[PDB]
Write a protein that binds this ligand. Structure first.
Ligand SMILES: *[C@@H]1O[C@H](CO)[C@@H](O[C@@H]2O[C@H](CO)[C@@H](O[C@@H]3O[C@H](CO[C@H]4O[C@H](CO)[C@@H](O)[C@H](O[C@H]5O[C@H](CO)[C@@H](O)[C@H](O)[C@@H]5O)[C@@H]4O)[C@@H](O)[C@H](O[C@H]4O[C@H](CO)[C@@H](O)[C@H](O)[C@@H]4O[C@H]4O[C@H](CO)[C@@H](O)[C@H](O)[C@@H]4O)[C@@H]3O)[C@H](O)[C@H]2NC(C)=O)[C@H](O)[C@H]1NC(C)=O
Ligand SMILES: *[C@@H]1O[C@H](CO)[C@@H](O[C@@H]2O[C@H](CO)[C@@H](O[C@@H]3O[C@H](CO[C@H]4O[C@H](CO)[C@@H](O)[C@H](O[C@H]5O[C@H](CO)[C@@H](O)[C@H](O)[C@@H]5O)[C@@H]4O)[C@@H](O)[C@H](O[C@H]4O[C@H](CO)[C@@H](O)[C@H](O)[C@@H]4O[C@H]4O[C@H](CO)[C@@H](O)[C@H](O)[C@@H]4O)[C@@H]3O)[C@H](O)[C@H]2NC(C)=O)[C@H](O)[C@H]1NC(C)=O
Ligand SMILES: *[C@@H]1O[C@H](CO)[C@@H](O[C@@H]2O[C@H](CO)[C@@H](O[C@@H]3O[C@H](CO[C@H]4O[C@H](CO)[C@@H](O)[C@H](O[C@H]5O[C@H](CO)[C@@H](O)[C@H](O)[C@@H]5O)[C@@H]4O)[C@@H](O)[C@H](O[C@H]4O[C@H](CO)[C@@H](O)[C@H](O)[C@@H]4O[C@H]4O[C@H](CO)[C@@H](O)[C@H](O)[C@@H]4O)[C@@H]3O)[C@H](O)[C@H]2NC(C)=O)[C@H](O)[C@H]1NC(C)=O
Ligand SMILES: *[C@@H]1O[C@H](CO)[C@@H](O[C@@H]2O[C@H](CO)[C@@H](O[C@@H]3O[C@H](CO[C@H]4O[C@H](CO)[C@@H](O)[C@H](O)[C@@H]4O)[C@@H](O)[C@H](O[C@H]4O[C@H](CO)[C@@H](O)[C@H](O)[C@@H]4O)[C@@H]3O)[C@H](O)[C@H]2NC(C)=O)[C@H](O)[C@H]1NC(C)=O
Ligand SMILES: *[C@@H]1O[C@H](CO)[C@@H](O[C@@H]2O[C@H](CO)[C@@H](O[C@@H]3O[C@H](CO[C@H]4O[C@H](CO)[C@@H](O)[C@H](O)[C@@H]4O)[C@@H](O)[C@H](O[C@H]4O[C@H](CO)[C@@H](O)[C@H](O)[C@@H]4O)[C@@H]3O)[C@H](O)[C@H]2NC(C)=O)[C@H](O)[C@H]1NC(C)=O
Ligand SMILES: *[C@@H]1O[C@H](CO)[C@@H](O[C@@H]2O[C@H](CO)[C@@H](O[C@@H]3O[C@H](CO)[C@@H](O)[C@H](O)[C@@H]3O)[C@H](O)[C@H]2NC(C)=O)[C@H](O)[C@H]1NC(C)=O
Ligand SMILES: *[C@@H]1O[C@H](CO)[C@@H](O[C@@H]2O[C@H](CO)[C@@H](O[C@@H]3O[C@H](CO)[C@@H](O)[C@H](O)[C@@H]3O)[C@H](O)[C@H]2NC(C)=O)[C@H](O)[C@H]1NC(C)=O
Ligand SMILES: *[C@@H]1O[C@H](CO)[C@@H](O[C@@H]2O[C@H](CO)[C@@H](O[C@@H]3O[C@H](CO)[C@@H](O)[C@H](O)[C@@H]3O)[C@H](O)[C@H]2NC(C)=O)[C@H](O)[C@H]1NC(C)=O
Ligand SMILES: *[C@@H]1O[C@H](CO)[C@@H](O[C@@H]2O[C@H](CO)[C@@H](O[C@@H]3O[C@H](CO)[C@@H](O)[C@H](O)[C@@H]3O)[C@H](O)[C@H]2NC(C)=O)[C@H](O)[C@H]1NC(C)=O
Ligand SMILES: *[C@@H]1O[C@H](CO)[C@@H](O[C@@H]2O[C@H](CO)[C@@H](O[C@@H]3O[C@H](CO)[C@@H](O)[C@H](O)[C@@H]3O)[C@H](O)[C@H]2NC(C)=O)[C@H](O)[C@H]1NC(C)=O
Ligand SMILES: *[C@@H]1O[C@H](CO)[C@@H](O[C@@H]2O[C@H](CO)[C@@H](O[C@@H]3O[C@H](CO)[C@@H](O)[C@H](O)[C@@H]3O)[C@H](O)[C@H]2NC(C)=O)[C@H](O)[C@H]1NC(C)=O
Ligand SMILES: *[C@@H]1O[C@H](CO)[C@@H](O[C@@H]2O[C@H](CO)[C@@H](O)[C@H](O)[C@H]2NC(C)=O)[C@H](O)[C@H]1NC(C)=O
Lengths: 196, 165, 196, 165, 196, 165
């Protein structure tokens, strides 16, 4: 407790919720449910599941923009997420449907029967999980089957990552809110592409 | 005035010194005030997690008091402002440490030394985490001991030259 | 004047024109006329007007490049400007015509009858003005109807922004020359795009 | 030699010290020379508007004396060189301050303190502007007073240790 | 040797080969042969020659990705190289053929009879040499006909730059291995494009 | 513990101090150890070529001892890690100097001063090259002399305050 003479060790813990009107805040409820607050009233829900909700592959992105019915904050976040997924060319893995400006995005990952493998390093499933790990950094560690991997060969038991617009309800029982995940993604984004 | 970091945008200070953290900045424990001597370290120090959080909090305050007019939804300001608010290098260091099972800062908890004989406090340092939890006080013992030495050294240097003329 | 003892407050003002051979310099003549020096002899004129000069929408960019008749410094600046305009997908707003390598670029902004509104935040007109504000930073403040907006919902009375190649004639009566506008744009550029 | 900032590329210095600003760098007032002690602060200080202008001016000189061969139109060099010449973070801070009606630096005018008893001068600081004009000397009074104290402190520290042995 | 009192000037030279398992290392054998180690066993050979090896222009990049038969480290390096070539739109200058995942890339530069000229500044040949200069920085200086140019108007006697996968054989007789060339390219990449 | 630069990720130090360079880090000359006083300068100094090499070497070690599991081919880690390991601004300065026929650092060779009366050594500085070779010791004479003065100054300051109380 007391170091050297009379220097007492003291602590402080920060309340990052007061930053919700200027910055989005990520938090975790449990291993399959992660959230982003994007303002005082609303946010995004990120779910790791075994059930698809989108059964087509149109992903009507250009039409969402022409119609302009979506919330812009939510769209900026989705763009940041997507742009940062390294080496994503496999568009058949992504499906979205902005019906009425509603946001619903699904990433279908090839979480194959990798009982004992380190092959699934060069795949889409890894690229999507990497972005996820950063967005929910600090709570995302319980979402994976593995531990201290290099995040460049990580796997989970779940097959789909579904991102949807929600109403904020303070679902942060596992990890506290923090702006770091998003800010740390904005700073780099599109630095993993292949043209040669 | 005193500070050159983000706070300086509007002079800030809040009080004569210490850039006090209010009761809504902290989780419990009401108010905490530091000395200008320690807070001012953020004027020069770039790669420090505590200083970055102060920069973000002060920004949030300024962005609410002023420029509250753009439909009260300027949540996008940060997409550019961030370049002037935080050191993303620190974020990368913490991500790398996480990948390697090296204790890392998740930015929620900080520790500092408080000289009970004066009220002089150090700039907070990040309490690190590893394997889902916080590290024990027995870890960091080298860092805590060094901060205590640093506080002692500054007190002595100040008196050697400024007390004695 | 004298602080503490004998410390006298002194000033200096910098002549940034001597930097014209290494850096472009922006300056302002009046609210509707802004300029960029791009070398010792030539530059660009940026005019805020109510009169279009281009009455078509071809914007023959790829042909300008195949022909290669344009000055490269001027083209690099135009690219930087354009790339930095956030969320620009509305190509019908832009028209250009590089006839003989001449540079003439027009941006047609939807400066609607926004007598009392804060709707024109999510529009093209705002995205173009934002880039403008930065390029002519330090003089651009008189170009707008509004004051300290967040530059993310700003409007002007003018409908077109026209950029053309000119001969440098020292048209800097409102604000002094400075390299900062351009350098501060080069540093960031393409950091506002939407894919999701 | 003495400086580590851009000037160091070719040693520079110009004179025995002070990295003198010539009559074409300044608007009026002929020449101004600073002390190495103040100019050298730019060796460590990254986020300072005055230091960035010095970096750009020295670059411009070097890019004219040397490497004048590429058709005398290497106006594009800066598109890459800028990363090593200025702190774009400062530019962002000044843009943010502008948006919020916070006085900001537009880089044209600087102030410094000149000790009339010695000729020792401080590193210049940016004179800020707000609402289309320059701020009055009554503003900044805290900053001017602090710079005067800082100059006093350095003079004293130098004598305490180096004059007295 | 001894400065002031008893301060002796001492030196150290670093062995950067021990970094080969974490970073690629560039080195030079002679003026026409430059190498990149990309791991403990393999690397890339970069040759400046007068003989083409690819006599077509298909450059089957998208098929290389669909097949996924190539080494990923080698491909990441090729992407970085290519992306960093400023103003590259002249795709007819590039040809590649990833047969079986093998890497073979050829850049055909218009090294015209520039006996006395400073015209070849705005060309492809210069853009490709610029990237080359950085990748083999520290040894690349002997690859050019000219000296301290601004690297924005440099020429060589060679017409082709050929990049191929090799086996590492320590071909570093002219300049020592160093990670700097590559790291210094990763940091900037795509900062020279024209859209206007 | 002592260092805050990359080394701090796993405390490091290697020995009680000096962050010793092993025989495989150097070309010949077996081992070299510095003092904590000099190595620690990299805690604050960002734009120094020697410090960047130390950051890369320590990273390489950590990335081999730990996290050796990802098929032993995580050669791609650096594509992101680099942002937290080196100052690319230095790389640009050296490229600019090369273009202008200004001696530049190619990162292979460094020099330092060694006080033969104590074993105290300075942080190494880059030996520069120009026109295909290394510069002579007659060049840099101003820089070598300044480093010798700096070492003298630190020795004196330490004794003035800490030896004498
Ligand atoms: C940096 O790393 C550190 C180290 O991991 C992270 O620190 C952790 O952060 C979390 C999130 O804030 C802390 O969780 C909180 O723990 C409280 C105490 O829990 C225990 O006691 C209570 C007593 O009632 C028991 O009920 C609990 O057991 C139940 O909950 C756990 C949850 O994990 C389940 O696993 C169990 O099975 C049980 O179901 C524990 O024994 C806990 O009370 C608190 O939960 C409330 O608050 C949250 C957030 O506001 C609400 O979402 C939640 O619904 C609860 O809210 C109700 O109750 C409060 C009571 O005060 C009312 O005020 C509300 O209105 C409402 O009715 C939460 O679970 C965790 O303790 C902490 N770990 C350590 C070691 O410190 C940092 O977050 C991380 N930083 C970042 C940025 O990532
Ligand atoms: C950071 O912010 C600060 C704060 O705003 C900016 O500071 C301002 O910068 C401008 C631009 O340099 C300064 O403007 C100059 O003011 C001179 C003085 O003007 C007054 O006196 C003259 C006396 O003759 C009157 O004629 C003027 O009135 C007329 O002009 C104003 C212009 O705004 C009109 O509004 C009026 O209606 C009148 O028409 C004023 O009463 C002024 O002389 C000077 O103009 C000459 O120089 C410029 C630039 O070289 C020429 O373009 C212009 O044509 C003039 O040149 C002729 O005259 C000179 C005489 O010396 C000859 O040498 C030439 O060859 C030629 O014949 C200019 O308008 C402004 O004063 C200053 N404000 C403050 C508070 O300091 C910084 O710029 C900004 N920094 C950055 C980077 O943005
Ligand atoms: C920053 O800038 C500086 C300044 O330019 C660069 O410094 C240079 O770096 C190079 C590369 O390491 C140094 O080259 C080495 O020089 C050795 C000595 O050469 C002389 O003596 C030998 C005696 O045998 C003669 O044979 C040589 O002549 C022959 O080689 C030269 C090569 O350029 C030809 O031009 C001649 O025509 C001759 O053919 C010279 O007179 C030299 O021994 C060494 O070569 C061996 O090592 C390399 C690398 O490992 C092998 O690739 C090569 O095949 C040789 O290896 C055999 O021999 C060794 C013997 O020890 C065995 O151990 C091996 O197993 C194998 O059998 C190499 O050429 C150069 O001297 C140095 N310049 C200065 C001024 O210091 C920095 O690199 C640069 N930094 C960066 C990052 O770019
Ligand atoms: C998401 O982010 C927002 C932004 O930070 C947070 O909202 C802030 O919450 C704090 C705490 O509740 C607010 O501060 C308090 O405001 C009370 C109301 O008066 C203010 O607001 C009215 C307009 O509604 C103004 O006219 C008035 O002038 C004030 O500005 C004050 O009464 C409070 O002071 C008194 O009570 C407190 C105890 O609650 C005592 O400690 C004080 O000493 C005093 O007696 C206090 O000032 C703040 O204003 C809110 N900001 C905004 C912009 O609305 C959200 O809380 C956050 N979400 C979460 C979960 O934290
Ligand atoms: C756009 O940017 C350019 C680049 O900075 C500026 O051009 C510089 O302008 C200054 C001031 O006029 C020049 O400096 C002066 O040059 C005179 C001419 O001699 C030089 O040039 C010839 C070749 O033309 C060389 O052979 C010779 O060796 C010199 O290098 C000198 O005579 C001047 O010195 C004398 O007169 C001045 C008063 O004018 C006195 O103060 C001196 O003490 C001395 O008696 C002086 O050196 C500089 O050379 C120009 N640079 C270039 C590259 O040409 C433009 O001015 C700028 N645009 C604007 C509007 O500012
Ligand atoms: C996720 O976002 C969607 C919007 O894309 C939310 O559902 C729909 O939200 C709109 C408002 O944006 C509701 O419109 C309402 O229409 C009535 C007239 O019929 C009008 O009186 C109301 O004032 C309002 O404009 C729409 O009804 C609503 N859809 C449904 C089925 O209720 C959705 O709720 C968001 N998800 C979550 C979890 O919050
Ligand atoms: C998410 O991606 C997986 C693949 O990683 C998709 O599963 C695959 O679906 C195809 C059909 O589209 C299966 O092929 C064949 O289908 C016919 C029925 O049409 C069946 O009779 C054949 O025997 C065969 O199964 C393929 O085997 C299956 N792959 C695996 C590993 O099961 C999945 O449908 C995608 N989910 C969504 C929502 O898009
Ligand atoms: C904006 O740029 C255009 C060029 O794109 C300038 O107009 C034209 O400039 C060219 C030179 O680039 C002039 O060419 C001349 O042709 C005669 C032969 O007829 C030759 O003897 C000259 O040496 C030169 O090569 C062209 O005549 C000129 N166009 C006109 C109508 O005069 C334009 O002036 C620039 N705008 C401003 C305001 O400076
Ligand atoms: C710049 O953009 C504005 C729109 O923001 C353009 O003005 C619009 O022009 C269309 C015609 O292309 C007008 O629609 C109809 O035109 C017919 C004539 O063909 C007329 O009989 C109808 O009554 C109707 O006006 C549209 O109303 C008009 N919008 C506004 C707000 O006036 C403008 O032409 C564009 N300028 C350039 C140079 O492209
Ligand atoms: C440059 O890369 C190519 C590969 O793209 C290297 O050539 C080929 O490499 C593959 C292995 O990647 C060899 O495959 C072998 O097949 C036999 C069965 O026939 C199997 O038993 C072996 O274990 C192995 O899988 C392939 O034979 C080889 N091609 C030739 C003609 O030998 C090429 O060698 C690399 N270049 C350099 C200079 O190293
Ligand atoms: C690399 O690029 C150069 C151009 O910079 C290519 O050389 C050019 O090749 C064309 C033919 O494709 C030559 O045009 C004509 O070809 C016919 C034969 O089909 C001949 O009878 C005509 O007299 C005429 O030569 C063109 O002149 C030639 N350019 C030069 C400067 O020699 C070269 O083939 C390209 N290399 C590769 C591997 O693609
Ligand atoms: C914005 O933040 C305020 C609090 O700062 C929220 O206020 C709550 O509103 C509900 C009614 O919808 C009340 O029952 C609560 O008591 C209020 N809370 C407090 C602390 O007073 C508000 O709901 C938030 N969202 C919006 C859209 O304004």
């Amino acid at each position: 407790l007391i170091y050297k003479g009379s220097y007492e060790l003291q602590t402080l813990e920060l309340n990052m919720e007061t930053l919700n009107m200027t910055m989005p805040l990520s938090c975790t409820k449990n291993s399959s449910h992660h959230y982003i607050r994007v303002g005082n009233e609303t946010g995004l829900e990120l779910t790791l599941t075994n059930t698809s909700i989108i059964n087509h592959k149109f992903c009507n992105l250009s039409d969402a923009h022409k119609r302009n019915l979506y919330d812009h904050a939510l769209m900026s976040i989705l763009s940041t997420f997507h742009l940062s997924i390294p080496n994503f060319n496999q568009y058949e893995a992504m499906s979205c449907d902005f019906n009425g400006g509603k946001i619903s995005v699904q990433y279908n990952l090839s979480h194959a029967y990798a009982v004992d493998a380190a092959e699934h390093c060069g795949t889409v499933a890894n690229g999507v999980l990497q972005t996820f790990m950063r967005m929910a950094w600090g709570g995302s560690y319980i979402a994976l089957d593995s531990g201290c991997g290099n995040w460049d060969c990580i796997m989970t038991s779940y097959q789909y990552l579904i991102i949807q617009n929600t109403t904020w309800e303070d679902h942060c029982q596992f990890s506290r809110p923090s702006p770091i995940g998003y800010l740390g993604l904005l700073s780099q984004r599109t630095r993993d592409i292949y043209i040669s | 005035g005193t500070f050159t970091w983000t706070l300086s945008d509007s002079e800030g200070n809040e009080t004569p010194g210490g850039y006090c953290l209010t009761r809504w900045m902290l989780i419990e424990a009401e108010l905490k005030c530091f000395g200008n001597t320690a807070v001012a370290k953020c004027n020069e120090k770039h790669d420090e997690e505590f200083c970055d959080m102060l920069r973000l909090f002060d920004f949030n305050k300024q962005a609410i008091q002023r420029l509250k007019s753009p439909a009260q939804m300027s949540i996008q300001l940060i997409n550019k402002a961030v370049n002037a608010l935080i050191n993303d290098q620190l974020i990368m260091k913490n991500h790398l440490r996480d990948m390697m099972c090296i204790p890392y800062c998740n930015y929620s908890k900080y520790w500092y030394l408080n000289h009970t004989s004066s009220g002089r406090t150090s700039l907070p340092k990040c309490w690190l985490v590893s394997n889902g939890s916080y590290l024990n006080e027995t870890h960091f013992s080298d860092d805590i001991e060094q901060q205590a030495d640093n506080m002692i050294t500054e007190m002595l240097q100040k008196e050697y030259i400024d007390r004695q003329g």
